Ligand binder design. Sequence first.
Ligand SMILES: [Mg+2]
Ligand SMILES: [Zn+2]
Ligand SMILES: [Zn+2]
Ligand SMILES: [Zn+2]
Lengths: 557, 178, 268, 107, 84, 112, 97, 171
Amino acid sequence: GQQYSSAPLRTVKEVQFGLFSPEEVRAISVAKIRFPETMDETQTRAKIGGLNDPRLGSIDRNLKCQTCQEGMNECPGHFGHIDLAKPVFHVGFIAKIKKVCECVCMHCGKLLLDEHNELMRQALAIKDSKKRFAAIWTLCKTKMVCETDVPSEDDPTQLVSRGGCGNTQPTIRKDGLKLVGSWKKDRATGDADEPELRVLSTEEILNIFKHISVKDFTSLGFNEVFSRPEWMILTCLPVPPPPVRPSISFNESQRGEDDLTFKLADILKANISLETLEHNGAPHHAIEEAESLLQFHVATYMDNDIAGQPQALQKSGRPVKSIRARLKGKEGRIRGNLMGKRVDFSARTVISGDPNLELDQVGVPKSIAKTLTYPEVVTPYNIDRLTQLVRNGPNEHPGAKYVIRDSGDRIDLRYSKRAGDIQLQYGWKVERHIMDNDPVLFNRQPSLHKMSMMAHRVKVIPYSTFRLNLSVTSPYNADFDGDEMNLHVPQSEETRAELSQLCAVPLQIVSPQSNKPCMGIVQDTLCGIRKLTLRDTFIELDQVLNMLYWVPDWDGV
Amino acid sequence: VSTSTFQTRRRRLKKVEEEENAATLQLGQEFQLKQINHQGEEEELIALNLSEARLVIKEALVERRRAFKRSQKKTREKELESIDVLLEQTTGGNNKDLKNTMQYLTNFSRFRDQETVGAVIQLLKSTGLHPFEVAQLGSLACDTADEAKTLIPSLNNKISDDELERILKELSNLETLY
Amino acid sequence: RLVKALEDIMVHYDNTTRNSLGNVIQFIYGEDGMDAAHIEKQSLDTIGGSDAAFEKRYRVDLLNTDHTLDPSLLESGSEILGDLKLQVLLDEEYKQLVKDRKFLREVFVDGEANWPLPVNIRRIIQNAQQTFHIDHTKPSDLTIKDIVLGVKDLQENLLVLRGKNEIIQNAQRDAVTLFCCLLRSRLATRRVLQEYRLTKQAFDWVLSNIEAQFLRSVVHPGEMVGVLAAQSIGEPATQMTKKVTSGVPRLKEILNVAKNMKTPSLTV
Amino acid sequence: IFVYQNNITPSAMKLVPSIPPATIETFNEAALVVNITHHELVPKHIRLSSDEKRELLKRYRLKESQLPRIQRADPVALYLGLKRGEVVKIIRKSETSGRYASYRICM
Amino acid sequence: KAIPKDQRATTPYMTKYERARILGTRALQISMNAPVFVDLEGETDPLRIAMKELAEKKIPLVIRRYLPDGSFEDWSVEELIVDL
Amino acid sequence: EAGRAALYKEVYNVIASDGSYVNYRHMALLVDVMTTQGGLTSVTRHGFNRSNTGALMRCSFEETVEILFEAGASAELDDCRGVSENVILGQMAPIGTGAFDVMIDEESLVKY
Amino acid sequence: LRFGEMERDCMIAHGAASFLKERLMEASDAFRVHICGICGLMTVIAKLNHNQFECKGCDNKIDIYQIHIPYAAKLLFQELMAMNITPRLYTDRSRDF
Amino acid sequence: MFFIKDLSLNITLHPSFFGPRMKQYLKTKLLEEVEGSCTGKFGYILCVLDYDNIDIQRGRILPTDGSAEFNVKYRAVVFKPFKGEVVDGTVVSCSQHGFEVQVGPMKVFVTKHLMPQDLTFNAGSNPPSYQSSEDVITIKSRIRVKIEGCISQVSSIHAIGSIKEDYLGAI
DNA sequence: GCACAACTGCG
DNA sequence: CGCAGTTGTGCTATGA
Ligand SMILES: [Mg+2]
Ligand SMILES: [Zn+2]
Ligand SMILES: [Zn+2]
Ligand SMILES: [Zn+2]
């Protein structure tokens, strides 16, 4: 598969969540990410030094990456950056940005309240990052003037000049992507009566956040190393590399760019409108116009499914798939790709009940047995047997599909000009057929039980169905009305141990759910066990003998 | 996989302010005067002067050769050829570094005999100088207190010009003759 | 929601029940520290019936002629009549059984006798009999001391928590409390001899099994009781088909911590 | 302890923390008619000394957070005049153990 | 921090989980051509070879039983009882 | 404490109604879990998903992105003590089989 | 086939830690990324041939580790970075408990 | 100079080695990896001290494969050069650009310019040399050099040195 | 199609 | 300053 790397192999012990500082975004970035045009060196098929591989990851499958070498299955993407023309909010933090504004003075960047207020020091005391901010906010949202002189911690006769600035504070209410405040004012003490109404610029808010004291934002949710409030407002944009937004290159001459590759081009275009718009003869209205648009493009790229309607619909009516939407539950990254997964070494078929199978076994069709494989390692113990299975080929029942050398290289017994003469060396792996008596995980969805997934013994059988013992129907919730079930094959000698030693059907016999057995004798057997056990019921020797023989443990008495 | 040390510090995200290292007695993080060991105790940094150095490797490779044969049960130019033998016995050969090191050490050792090395260490270690200076004084041969204070500029006001000279005088007397 | 709410809960190497925070949910899993599979609904015989029939069943009085154990029961019976030192032991024995009764009656207020507990004591004696071909005629070789004390000594070895300190030692005592009530119920001097008719050999075996069978019964540190419990409540909720909101929707109300519940009654 | 008939004005309510280390308690006479602690479902709550608490945390290799919490306003916590940080031992009868000891740290 | 041998508290018996991972570990190791500390009495399945090893208590592994607080008690496959 | 009692009673009465029997311990755990925190913690997106548990763990139910957003916002640190985190990380979880570590002791490896 | 969320649950219930990792990694997603020891991000330029390992931005050429995570996680991570969030992966701890 | 540092390397043994000469193999594998090694952190790792007493520690068996990782705690003689360190060495190479001096395991180079003006290169010399009014520096020539700066390169450290100041140069 | 959680305004 | 009243917001079984 992937190649040897000298790098010390460890495990992720902690995950330290933080925020990107434009500085980092710049540093880590292998390219910027200047032109919306994907590739085609002016129609000439190969990537452009502008978007996707301006030193980023790679396309072509052949033709390795421009930063590391390795290529495709090895190379995780290499990050990019676009230097935004004007600071823009992060669609997500937009509410917290408002709440931070509501906490601090919009002029000197000092907390509206401090250690001088008792209900404030009470909140400043709260141990929890989130609960603390929540309490601070509730007290600070009420303060509409940055105090110059507060009454002393003893008398209201003498006043202490706690902090600078006297300025009146706005009443910030959001106007979707825009934060617009309404200041009280004064005018012969009266005003308001008719206040002052202006939108607060991303840049102004950013400048207030930059001036927020380490200790002040530290009292708020924030961290001086990983999450400074100023980092909620975006200046430098990380450009995710091809693997995040794959170019589905169907046939030779035909692209097929991902949704994100499109939305980025849109952010890029909108940024270049604004870039030149302001530098040149800035008609100052089309300036805040091209801005609101860039703010929209960066908003909908991260979240398209926002309150204030506009679905940023791809020219097809179909709305653009936001990154937020990608990770969003039951299907999509977290819920459906990580917590749940599609798996190799799995099988499914119709289940039919068998009276001649021991409780703990499962009838696996010959086809399924010949498809699914187990990686056995050439050991003096097996060696000879494995050579016979290799020799036998992938088409017989006991046989093998592949042989894996020391040189981690796969031999396809199915084709290999050597499948006949192939001398196995110890330590090689032989991916052989699911043979009788292997542990396997048998399963029936839904799966509300420890017992809805049990470990069975293989028994390779003819005919296309999975055959299971009737008594084990009850814990799966199976019936033979046309139900299908799943089979998972363990790959490790250690994993086989897990199933055998913990998940086995004989073990699962007495359920802790009810402190009573979960399987019993059922149907034909249950009806017949009464029918046989009545006093009126007697058996002649002829049948008594056959009935005795039939019990495999019979003592011959 | 590389090698790690007792120095357990955790610079989280905070890359740099990686100090320039000079004999302004500012050795690396790794080479701090105050440091730990496998036993978990604090211990003063170990610095060797050649010969005090040459004898360590000598000893270690000898006790190693003891075990290489224990488990296998069930005059300057003249010492040079003798050392090249011990290296062929206990070292991987691929370690051409230790060979060059031993040849250098053999020819550049100020004090041959151990008795002498022990006595050098007593003389210099009483001074209260930093281990890198107690090292440099034993390895570098000086006459003027100025010769010393120039090459080991870390001294300067640390020692008396006369007192440093008294040391240098006793060091030349100990100097094992070839 | 049930699984997602509990997933991270397991039994740690200190018989404690914690989550990813290591925040204690239960001090000892299911108040007793036993694996649910190793439980069987057993009868606490001490609990009910007349105080008169209780006395008949449990009381031994070597000082009274009509209330001693007949020398038909044990060999020692003839030489036991009047042993004041022994009547002291049978007095603790009886005064403890009397104590146990007042406790069970405090715990199970309705007088419910049948409770699910570990170690099927009924079956052990059953097997002791078939195993040692117990003669319900010839007198036992057991001593009053053999019984009384061997049972004392057994309880001491019925370990759930292990720690050497009052905090832990007292949690051991508590977690075990109810089982030993049943153990004392089934292993009273009169009961062991009259009913069971055990020999010393048979009795020692009964005890040895109870000990190791109990030990088997305890939870395994590593046991993923978060999901185990969540699945065990959730699963039967699937098989779900005065007039108060019941079943699936009431369960929905309970888990949701429904403020505006549908059928709120007060039973005065 | 102050057993007020109908109500206390927010005027007087602010005078309760004014005189520490002395602590004042307010109780509506109407709540006190019935002793909540006597109820079927209400088990034994036991105040633990600084040393008693210290040992519990030592013995279970605990941090105060890890412990199950009783709110400051918990009827039984008010009954015993629980202060934040103070731990209670809860002795409930068990349908599995007979007797079960739980512990609650204050809020 | 590491609980000393004379202060261990955990079950002197082997957990259902311990035994399963112990057996799986030797089985994996045995299969990976590791050295076998028992007489293979014609045995050929690493699990059976491992079970035989565990039975003769000739498995050379140690269980680091971690406690909620982080500290641990090291127990040996030799010293652990197998009532299972 | 009386709320826990009434909560179990109510929970038990739902299961027992359908005839069905669930061993005490199970329903007791659910109840004990909803109880511990201090009051009644709802088995909902704004109840158990509130607690100080891992952000990668909580994101795996209900407010998925929003949780992860607020993670980086107030620089949360994942313990990776939770099952879910290990599942996301592809690590062997500290569950049953993974609740302890296994080591070869050279002393005993030379004894045999 | 699908080793769905629900199947993970019973597998945990079972205490089958290893069979779960095997299902979730080896029999699916399993992938190898290089991480920086300073900022725990997949920033590393793994020229694993000349053994060159670098995280420019961190100036690191020393503190690099290799981790095995599901490719869907590498993705989820790059996906979060694309959204200005840093999911820093660290191979040692600090907190305790 | 020449330090002694208490280091530790993590070695992952394959199961095939979980035999009796295990400690034996681990000790030898440490020496393979560790000796002759060169990091910019610790410099040249030259000799592993106290082979008899190497602390093996227990090795945790790795999750999905059978190999077990051990942290092999040790102590060794190390040479890490410093800028401003004065070293006595022997000349090796010598050209129009300067001369490269052998100091232990490492090579210090003195630029034509980092020498006095009186010392000038002799092209027409067998072997090549630098000639002062008084001194001659060719090959075997023992020298004293002030290390001006170090460059941590691959599995070696190199340096640029001075023989211009007082008490430096030919010895 | 609910069930709650923020938020907001009049007594 | 409090509580009624609203506006707001996220979820809605499991495999083909
Ligand atoms: Mg059906
Ligand atoms: Zn690349
Ligand atoms: Zn201000
Ligand atoms: Zn980095």
